[PDB]
């Protein structure tokens, strides 16, 4: 039971995915071809959560790779851990999207999505008790954004009682990365608000800040960014794969993190984040870890959480630790700075812990924040949208594929309503 | 004989149960594999000689029970006593009850029936859950309800993990706990409640440990459980059967909540800087910080108190101690109860596990207390719930699985009534 | 002495027979080659010392019997006891009966006669066929009819493979089974029926096996057979001869169908998490899911029940168990029968083969049951038949070999009559 | 007992036949000259089913090769396993048929058929108990189609109580392969409806789809197609040659598969069908096997079975397997998708199983479907026929050999009636 089906969509989604599968492989003692070389039975206890088993003690990611844009997935295939994936789980088309949500969601994507659905259905049958679907995509592209949304819609329709979580790479609002990005992001957000249970919002600006300010690093590559994302992802599902004291789960996190159904946009983080060079200068106390977790500079969304109240926060620890220390730390944090946590929810925090630290660390932790401050992100996107749409700039590319003006307007309206709702709890 | 069954439900409950079983194995001489006199109260007598416990082990979470099934205390357990499903409630009262639990519950009932079929005088049950955790609150409530239909005359005692006022774990506890209270109330007899903050405080002061775990907590709980139960199993001057804890502790048939506290809880270091006499132990028992919940008991009259002395104990000394306690002005008591204290004195002492910090003591005590001072905590909980519910926090989750919101209102009303009753008692 | 012959017919029957013979070899000390006290009931005493069974082995399919003839249990068998032909009926009732079987049947009869010529008190027969399979249904019916002419006073017991409601194998079973029922009815005395779905369910729950075969099923069947027969062969407190299963089980001379169920059917793992006392076994026997067919026996009054306890068994305990069963409200019984239970207690226990999953038990039971609850299955079968026959599905095959369609109608009428009788009994 | 006489007719029939004899040879441990080199007594137990024995432990196919067209059979003879056949079992004429059913059935074929009949009679005498005749031919040619039908008529007349089964290669209706094909096919079908007990309908289009879509293959040759056919053929008769749990047989299959006498046209399939390259990506569970069996894309007739109800289905498994798993799988399939199986027949499926997997596989299975959807195939053929015949196009080639218009009309009528009957049970 507790089995998860993974989907990766578009270029970004595929790239992050590759890293994710490397990291999970490492964690579960799977070598690049798919053989197990672990020394602990803990490693295989719940290996089924991510991997199917095949003849000859072969383990295969329960993973589907989708891209209308071909060649990105060819790179994945050519890569080191590319050989672990099932060839029949590569679903790809013969035309790009030109960063066009409409082509991903309405036309080109609609032609490919049937295949993906078929594969998903097949995957679902090998679940004893399907926990849900985990998606990796990007907002600002065409495939991950449009087709990702399309696929999500379909899957929710077919499996409405299973959990739908998305790790979505959003724009960097201070320095935007395509021209039609705002249009795409706005169109996707509309779909995600309605058709997912949780969305982890990751932005490259924040990642770079983390790399530079916190980790004291330079020359960071997309690979490194993917690594960081993958670590958070793995952290999220640790309690489904392994033992512990308080064990989390997807819906458990959703239960503690989503106090109103539409407010399900999270800012993920990891701790510790210090330099590789200056290792010995610091040590691993639970208080230090929590400090790292909670500090704005260590978050991977493009907000100052200090410009808003936390509705709820989930901390997931790995390593054998004093629960007293944990709880007391949380309490102290709440007491000292009660203004940053909304006063209408007693005990805004949540703890979970797993007796199994990942590779090097003795103590690691994953942060999941739901703050009213995230309104800023949406607000800026809506500002961007309006400036263009009021002049109908770039709109012909979308109307040409059968999209209507009214839809755009409605999407904007929904985005604004989201912002308003967030402001309510601020 | 006075021969009975236990129930350990949800993650926390299961953890507690492991510790309990370990303690029992230590006490009765049983080796982790079932090999070795009066043990048989729990360990229903067996085929080839190797003893097997009578406990209901239930978790809709697979993981915790899976761990148990590959542990040391492994073959000891029957495969069936341990039960499994698929997924957590995730602190969701509307899943242990109503939706997902109404499926497994039948199996659990069957198991219980089977266990009963070995008793020649089933004195009742011990139930381990959590006022908070999703499985062990809704599901446990459901189970208790079911038991009420199938065993009307049999006692059903509960060991409960009340959430401490300040500290928290999962931020939907105030709903769940209240729901449990609403649906447990009339089906249980007694609900022995222990906080965690209090325990931590005790550890910091009394045991001189500032880096605790859950394991330690579990061990402590198990100790208390052992103290409660030992009169069933071993000999004694005065033997307190399970059915006494109804009649010497429930002054009215809705007030089902006692505070369970233990002494001496002091490590080897300044144990030898102490006498550990009976009177001292008794005094320790009635002090505020040594209590295993967060009440200021000086803010609340005692209704019924019950003490379970173990080891080298002379009744005269106990009597003297009790007299002294009675004399004290700060240890308040109700207008309507003169005979406030119930005493059990047992010739067998407590037994200490390897790893358990509490050192070997010739004499020890477990105290059980009903007071108006528990009401503070209840009030706090109610307040929390009210603050949550007015803005409709996370209500759609429980309602979205299968619930009326009027249920919540009913629960609140019940709580209010309870509070009123407590006030009346105080008067 | 109480000395008898068996009949194993069709593929399934032959398979069952192999298992049975293996079990017998284990029990009586006989080595697969015939070498080694009261064995001789089946194994008619022999020339040079090496024992040879008394079983009719028949298959119009060559293949299964060919396999047997090159197996391990090989020289054990007489060449003639095993019979061969050319081709299957192919689930075609009109070939075992009428066309192709009326040819071999004479040979079979001759063989049976020869076997009888060794008995000094032939108490009767055991017949293994399939309510469904083409050979072992028509052919077996024919054989039974023939026997009825040549042995009027001798009991003819049948072991039957009823098709389960939901699951199927070959999609002309509803015809064949009905036909068999029509032509078996008046020539057999008793027809012990076992489904496969039920067995699978048992395996999944009770034996903790989720990857079964036919072999396992066969072994289970053989166990039941052994339990049925053991009072002929070994000593006992109370000895149930073959002719008792007429008189303690057939309340009316058309109701010839009992359900054959076995306990304890639990593997070594949570056997040691169990007592396996007499009462428990008895309880298990009357539970719904442990039954070896798909009836809800709570939907149907019991007519006659018959129990065959084996091993370390004290009659007092048995009596107590029976009393308890009688007391239970859910175990319903007819208006016209107070003495509902027939008991056989045998000093020899059951014996376990290498490969057989069911572990060694000091005590075990086989239960035989007549109830109105069997009628549900019959009704279902009838319904299936009616649905098939109205559109004339595959009728031309049976009719094209040698049949009237009015036969089908007659069969249906018979079934209806049976149903009515059952209803009356229930009243 | 249970002996089968094989006839191969025409070019296609001969080619498929060669492959079939190779495969059967391999299965029974017969080397290309006819010597036995097996290691299991299971192999020879029922070798008589296909092979006669000769002096010097020589094994000879009970096989007759017929073609009016000479040279195709010369190729067979020249081939590797060509040397196993009895020279006296080659029956051939000195004139082609020009893809003309009339020449095969009425005139040229009539001159050769006597010889074939004589050989068949001779063959029959070496059966202890003849199970029946197995024919391999093609519809759309002249010899396999016309002369095949002629031969079938004769043999049924002489051995009406033995089973007559034909593996017949039909047209690919979307891209037809001769010009007079429709005429030939229609003429043959008439004969086969009346004079055979079962006909396995194989179409090259479906085979190519299997090769490309399912097996992930390219450059497939007629050899490869023949292989696929041969595998199904061998699967069909496995239970006559070998041991098992539930053993099938020809008439047993007919009993379960033919609920009305004329509805005896089957869609054969094999499973598993996955890529050679992506082997490790999948494994051999009974559920997976059944999925492969039942999926439309894995069938070898030119229907969507989802556009009709299954009247009956026979599955024949090879390998040691859990009967529980089998039955339960079937039950689940029926329950989930009851609409695709006609509701007037409780338990539309049938299982058979043999303890002996073929060469490589641990678990293999053969599918035999009788669906109302096959009406589509006949319907299209009748459409084709009508368009030509209403203009009497190409008709002179047939009338010239003594065929009459009325016959054509009657054949069309019968075909239409067949379609109507199929529609009844839809
Ligand atoms: C000598 C030594 O102790 O080296 C450490 C190290 O120096 C530090 C700096 C590591 C290092 O991580 C990074 O520098 C980094 C680079 C890009 C993006 C993000 C991080 C390290 O590379 C990462 C590596 O992490 C792991 O081994 C974890 O198991 C981690 N694994 C991966 O990310 C991974 C990398 C390559 C291949 C496969 C997996 C993990 C974390 C969470 C969940 C699952 C796995 C560790 C501890 C170290 C090095 C090697 C220097 C740190 O990161 C992690 C994720 O542990 C950065 O801050 C921490 C603190 C560590 O002490
Ligand atoms: C290393 C290995 O395991 O190789 C396999 C293999 O890769 C696969 C892909 C085989 C392969 O089959 C094909 O690629 C194929 C080519 C044309 C038409 C049809 C199939 C294989 O060639 C076929 C071959 O089949 C057999 O050996 C069977 O006994 C089969 N034999 C023949 O068809 C045969 C071929 C040449 C000469 C004589 C006989 C058989 C099947 C049913 C009934 C009787 C015999 C097998 C398992 C394999 C190879 C060799 C790669 C598969 O096919 C079969 C029939 O087994 C295709 O999907 C299955 C799955 C197998 O795993
Ligand atoms: C509780 C939620 C939370 C709220 C606040 C403001 C928290 C509280 C504390 O951390 C837990 C701050 C912390 O105790 C420190 C002072 C040690 C420190 O880390 O503060 C930051 C600046 C602070 O914001 C001012 C930070 O960015 C932050 O987020 O602080 C500089 C840093 O230089 C090394 C160091 O001086 C937001 O998620
Ligand atoms: C029962 C008879 C039977 C009826 C149906 C419709 C059956 C049922 C199921 O198979 C047993 C389908 C199956 O469970 C899957 C979903 C895994 C799957 O295989 O379905 C197909 C499409 C489906 O038709 C829609 C298929 O073609 C088919 O035939 O399905 C795509 C495929 O991509 C990998 C995969 O997604 C016809 O013989
Ligand atoms: N003393 C003690 N408390 C525990 C333990 N495990 C969990 N808890 C407490 O129990 C509460 C959480 O409930 P759990 O038992 O973990 O939850 P659950 O019953 O599994 O329910 P779900 O996980 O919600 O399905 C928190 O207050 C924890 O502090 C334990 O081993 N000992
Ligand atoms: N329990 C059990 N059932 C079997 C066995 N073999 C077959 N069956 C069942 O018997 C029925 C099929 O009848 P078979 O005995 O195989 O048929 P047959 O008597 O040989 O008749 P034909 O083959 O039709 O000539 C199905 O319900 C099978 O599940 C077996 O070894 N054990
Ligand atoms: N973190 C991360 N961001 C990426 C990666 N690849 C592309 N991006 C970002 O994704 C956005 C571009 O979308 P992309 O996924 O490449 O387009 P698509 O293939 O049409 O979906 C930009 O904001 C890029 O910065 C990656 O591997 N990691
Ligand atoms: N599957 C298969 N089809 C064939 C083969 N040879 C010919 N065909 C097909 O058979 C039809 C042509 O008939 P053919 O047998 O060659 O003509 P004939 O010799 O007059 O009977 C066409 O549909 C061809 O695609 C073969 O070896 N295998
Ligand atoms: Mg849990
Ligand atoms: Mg047979």
CATH number of the domain that D386 lies in? 1.10.287.600
Helix, strand counts (H, E) of chain A: 16, 12
The answer to whether the CB of A392 is under 6 A from ligand 4 is no
Cα gap A59→A41, rounded to integer Å: 15
Ligand with the closest atom to the CA of A56: 2
Q: Looking at the structure, do residues B394 and B281 belong to the same domain, yes or no?
A: no
Strand pairing report for B155-160 and B122-128: parallel
**DSSP characters for B232-283?**
HHS--SB---TTHHHHTT-SSTT----EEEEE----STTTTT----HHHHHH
Cα D13 from chain centroid (whole Å) = 10
Task: Work out the angle at residue C334's Cα, subtended by the Cα atoms of residues C339 and C255, and round it to the nearest 5 degrees.
Answer: 90
Helix (H/G/I), strand (E/B), else coil: D58:
strand
CB of A7 closer than 8 Å to CB of A66? yes
Rounded to a whole number of angstroms, the distance from the CA of A60 to the nearest CA of chain D is 7
A361 and A382 both lie in a single domain: no
Of B96, B101, B161, B215, best ligand 5 pocket probe by most atoms within 8 Å of the beta carbon: B161
- CB-closest option in B61, B70, B217 to A247: B61
| CATH code of the domain covering residue D342 | 3.30.1330.20
Evaluate: CB of A296 within 6 angstroms of ligand 3: yes
Can you list the positions of beta strands (E) in A261-383?
265-271, 310-318, 349-354, 364-371
Q: How many helices (H) and strands (E) does chain C have?
A: 14, 10
Backbone interruptions in chain C following residues (C to N > 2.5 Å): 36
C55: left (phi over 0), alpha (psi -120 to 50) or beta: beta
* Both structure tokens of A65: 């790779």
CB C300 within 8 A of CB C332: yes
Question: Is C349 in the same domain as C410?
Answer: no
- For A317, list phi and psi in degrees, rounded to 5: -95, 150
Domain count, chain A: 3
Task: Give yes or no: residues A294 and A264 share one domain.
Answer: yes
In eight-state DSSP terms, residue B164 is: P
Hey, are the CB atoms on D281 and A60 less than 8 Å from each other?
Answer: yes
Cα distance between residue C294 and residue C283, in whole Å: 18
A381 and A284 assigned to the same domain:
no
Residue B385's CATH number: 1.10.287.600
8 A C-beta contact, residue D10 and residue D143: yes
User: What is the DSSP annotation of D144-197?
Assistant: IIIIHHHHHHHHHHH-TTSEEEEEEEE--TTS-SSSSHHHHHHHHHHHHHHH-S
CA–CA separation, B87 vs C422, rounded Å? 46
Residue D343, classed as helix, strand or coil, is coil
Same-domain check for residues D350 and D218? no
Question: CA A45: distance to chain centroid?
Answer: 25
Note whether B190 and B161 are within 8 A (CB): no
Q: What is the largest CA-CA distance in chain B?
A: 61
- Contact predicate B81/B26, CB 8 Å: no
CB C235 within 8 A of CB C36: no
Q: Are strands C363-371 and C259-263 parallel, antiparallel or unpaired?
A: antiparallel
Describe the crossing of helices C197-205 and D323-336 by its angle, rounded to 10 degrees: 110
CATH number of the domain bearing residue B300: 3.30.1330.20
When divided into structural domains, chain C yields a total of 3
Expressed in angstroms, the distance from the first to the final Cα of chain C is 42
Burial class (CB in 10 A: 0-12, 13-18, 19+), B122: buried
How far is Cα B187 from Cα B180, in angstroms, rounded to an integer? 11
Q: Which of D259, D293, D327 is the last residue of a domain?
A: D259
CATH code of the domain covering residue B222? 3.40.50.1440
| Final resolution, Å | 3.5
CB B177 within 8 A of CB B163: yes
Examine the residue annotation and report whether C269 is marked as an active-site residue of this protein.
no
CA distance A183 to A405: 12
Owning domain of residue D89? 1-259
CB contact under 8 A, C196 and D347: no
Q: Which residues pair with D366 in a beta bridge?
A: D270, D316
A307 and A395 part of one domain: no
Looking at the structure, do residues C216 and C253 belong to the same domain, yes or no?
A: yes
The token pair that represents B273 in the structure block: 């800087």
Distances in whole angstroms, Cα of residue C44 to Cα of each of A268, C4, C120, C226, D269: 82, 9, 11, 17, 51
Q: Do D143 and D267 belong to one domain?
A: no
Nearest in space to C58 (alpha carbons), one of C101, C113, C3: C101
> What residues are in contact with ligand 6 under a 6 Å CB criterion?
C 10-12, 15-16, 60-61, 88-91, 130, 132-136, 161, 163, 169, 196, 214, 217-218; D 246
Q: Are residues A272 and A242 in the same domain?
A: no
C264 preceded by a cis bond (ω within 30 of 0): yes
Read off the tokens for B81.
């006593």
Measure A217 CA to ligand 1 centroid, in angstroms: 13
Q: If you ran DSSP here, which 8-state letter would residue C91 be given?
A: S
- Same domain for A414 and A318? no
> C194 with C234, same domain?
yes
Token pair of B30, please?
Answer: 């049983």
Domain end among D238, D259, D280 = D259
Sign of the Cα pseudo-torsion (B151, B153, B159, B164, in order): positive
Q: How was this structure determined?
A: cryo-EM
- Among all ligands shown, which has an atom nearest to the Cα of D141? 8
User: Mapping DSSP to helix (H, G, I), strand (E, B) and coil, where does residue A102 land?
Assistant: helix
Q: A242 and A160 in one domain?
A: yes
What are the helix (H) ranges across B9-79?
Answer: 10-27, 62-69
Please report, for the domain that includes residue A21, its CATH number. Answer: 3.40.50.1440
Judged by DSSP in three states, B121 sits in coil
Cis preceding linkage at D272, omega within 30: yes
Ligand 10 midpoint to CA D252 (Å)? 9
Residues B63, B117 within the same domain: yes
Among A212, A230, A259, identify where a domain stops: A259
Which residue of chain D has the CA closest to A57?
Answer: D280
Are B2 and B132 in a shared domain? yes
For C171, the domain range is: 1-258
* CA gap C172, C179 in Å, rounded: 11
- Is B265 in the same domain as B236? no
Q: Are residues B369 and B385 in the same domain?
A: no
- Ligand 7 mutation target, pool A7, A12, A100, most atoms within 8 A of CB: A12
- Regarding whether C197 and C282 lie in a shared domain, the answer is no
Where does a domain end: C348, C373, C398?
C373
User: Which of C258, C289, C307 marks a domain boundary?
Assistant: C258
What's the first-to-final CA gap in chain A, in angstroms?
Answer: 39
Determine contact: B397 vs chain A, CB below 8 A.
yes
Same domain, A115 and A128: yes
Q: Which two tokens stand for residue D217?
A: 């293959």
In A, minimum Cα distance to D216 occurs at A88
Q: Residue whose CA is closest, atom 6 of ligand 3?
A: A306
* Same-domain check for residues C105 and C4: yes
Please tell me the distance in Å from C87's CA to the nearest CA on chain D.
Answer: 7
Torsion on CA atoms A396, A402, A405, A407, rounded to nearest 10? -140
Q: Are residues B280 and B327 both part of a single domain?
A: yes
Is-contact B229 B288, C-beta < 8 A?
A: no
* Ordered alpha helix ranges (H), C130-258: 140-150, 173-184, 197-205, 214-233, 244-247
* In a shared domain, residues C226 and C110: yes
Distance of alpha carbon C395 from alpha carbon B331, whole angstroms: 93
- Say yes or no: D248 and D264 in one domain: no
Give the max Cα distance, chain C. Answer: 61
* A55 and A106 belong to one structural domain: yes
């Amino acid at each position: 039971m507790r089995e998860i089906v993974h989907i990766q969509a578009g270029q970004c989604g595929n790239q992050i995915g590759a890293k994710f599968w490397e990291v999970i492989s490492d964690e579960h003692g799977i070598d690049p071809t798919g053989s197990y070389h672990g020394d602990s039975d803990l490693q295989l206890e719940r290996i089924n959560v991510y991997y199917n088993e095949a003849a000859g003690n072969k383990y295969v990611p329960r993973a589907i790779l989708v891209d209308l844009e071909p060649g990105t997935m060819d790179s994945v295939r050519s890569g080191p851990f590319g050989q672990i994936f099932r060839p029949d789980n590569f679903v790809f088309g013969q035309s790009g999207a030109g960063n066009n949500w409409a082509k991903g969601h309405y036309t080109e994507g609609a032609e490919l999505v049937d295949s993906v659905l078929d594969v998903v259905r097949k995957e679902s049958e090998s679940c004893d008790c399907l926990q849900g679907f985990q998606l990796t995509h990007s907002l600002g592209g065409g495939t991950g954004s449009g087709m990702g949304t399309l696929l999500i819609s379909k899957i929710r329709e077919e499996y409405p009682d299973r959990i739908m979580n998305t790790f979505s790479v959003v724009p960097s609002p201070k320095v935007s990365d395509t021209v039609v990005e705002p249009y795409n992001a706005t169109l996707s957000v509309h779909q995600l608000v309605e058709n997912t249970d949780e969305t982890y919002c990751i932005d490259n600006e924040a990642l770079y800040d983390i790399c530079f300010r916190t980790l004291k690093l330079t020359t960071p590559t997309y690979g490194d960014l993917n690594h960081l994302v993958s670590a958070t992802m793995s952290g999220v599902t640790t309690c489904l794969r392994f033992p512990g004291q308080l064990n989390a789960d997807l819906r458990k996190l959703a239960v503690n993190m989503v106090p109103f159904p539409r407010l399900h946009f999270f800012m993920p983080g990891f701790a510790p984040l210090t330099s590789r060079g200056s290792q010995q200068y610091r040590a691993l106390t639970v208080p230090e870890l929590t400090q790292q977790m909670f500090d704005a500079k260590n978050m991977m969304a493009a907000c100052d959480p200090r410009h808003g109240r936390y509705l709820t926060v989930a901390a997931v620890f790995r390593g054998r630790m004093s629960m007293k220390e944990v709880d007391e730390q949380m309490l102290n944090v709440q007491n000292k700075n009660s203004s940053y946590f909304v006063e209408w929810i007693p005990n805004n925090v949540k703890t979970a812990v797993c007796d199994i630290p990942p590779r090097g660390l003795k103590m690691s932790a994953t942060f999941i924040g739901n703050s009213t401050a995230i309104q800023e992100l949406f607000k800026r996107i809506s500002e961007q949208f309006t400036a263009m749409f009021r002049r109908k700039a770039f709109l012909h590319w979308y109307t040409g594929e059968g999209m209507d003006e009214m839809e755009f307007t409605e999407a904007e309206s929904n985005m604004n309503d989201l912002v308003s709702e967030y402001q309510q709890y601020q | 004989m006075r021969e009975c069954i236990s129930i350990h439900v949800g993650q926390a409950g299961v953890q507690i149960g492991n510790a309990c079983w370990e303690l029992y194995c230590l006490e009765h001489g049983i080796q982790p594999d079932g090999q070795m006199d009066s043990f048989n109260t729990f360990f229903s007598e067996t085929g080839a000689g190797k003893h097997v416990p009578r406990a209901v082990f239930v978790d809709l979470e697979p993981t915790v029970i899976d761990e148990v099934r590959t542990g040391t205390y492994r073959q000891l357990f029957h495969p069936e006593q341990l039960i499994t499903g698929k997924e957590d409630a995730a602190n969701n009262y509307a899943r242990g009850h109503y939706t997902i639990g109404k499926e497994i519950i039948d199996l659990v009932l069957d198991r219980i029936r089977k266990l009963a079929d070995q008793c020649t005088g089933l004195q009742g049950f011990l139930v381990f859950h959590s006022f908070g955790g999703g499985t062990g609150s809704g599901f446990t409530s459901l189970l208790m309800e079911r038991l009420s239909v199938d065993y009307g005359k049999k006692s059903k005692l509960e060991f409960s993990i009340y959430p401490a006022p300040q500290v928290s774990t999962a931020v939907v506890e105030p709903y769940n706990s209240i729901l449990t209270t609403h649906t447990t109330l009339e089906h249980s007899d007694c609900a022995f409640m222990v906080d965690n903050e209090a325990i931590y405080d005790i550890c910091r002061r009394n045991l001189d440990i500032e880096r605790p775990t859950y394991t330690n907590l579990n061990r402590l709980i198990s100790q208390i459980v052992s103290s409660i139960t030992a009169s069933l199993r071993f000999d004694g001057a005065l033997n307190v059967d399970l059915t006494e804890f109804q009649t010497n502790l429930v002054p009215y048939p809705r007030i089902h909540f006692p505070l369970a506290t233990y002494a001496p809880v002091i490590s080897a270091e300044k144990a030898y800087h102490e006498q550990l006499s009976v009177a001292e132990i008794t005094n320790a028992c009635f002090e505020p910080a040594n209590q295993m919940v967060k009440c200021d008991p000086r803010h609340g009259k005692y209704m019924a108190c019950c003490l379970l002395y173990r080891g080298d104990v002379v009744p005269k000394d106990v009597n003297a101690a009790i007299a002294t306690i009675k004399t004290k002005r700060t240890i308040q008591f109700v207008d309507w109860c003169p005979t406030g204290f119930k005493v059990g004195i047992n010739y067998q002492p407590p037994t200490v596990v390897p790893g358990g910090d509490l050192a070997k003591v010739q004499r020890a005590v477990c105290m059980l207390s009903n007071t108006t001072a528990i009401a503070e905590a209840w009030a706090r909980l109610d307040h929390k719930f009210d603050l949550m519910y007015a803005k409709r926090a996370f209500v759609h989750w429980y309602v979205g699985e299968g619930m009326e919101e009027g249920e919540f209102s009913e629960a609140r009303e019940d709580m209010a009534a309870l509070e009123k009753d407590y006030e009346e008692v105080g008067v």
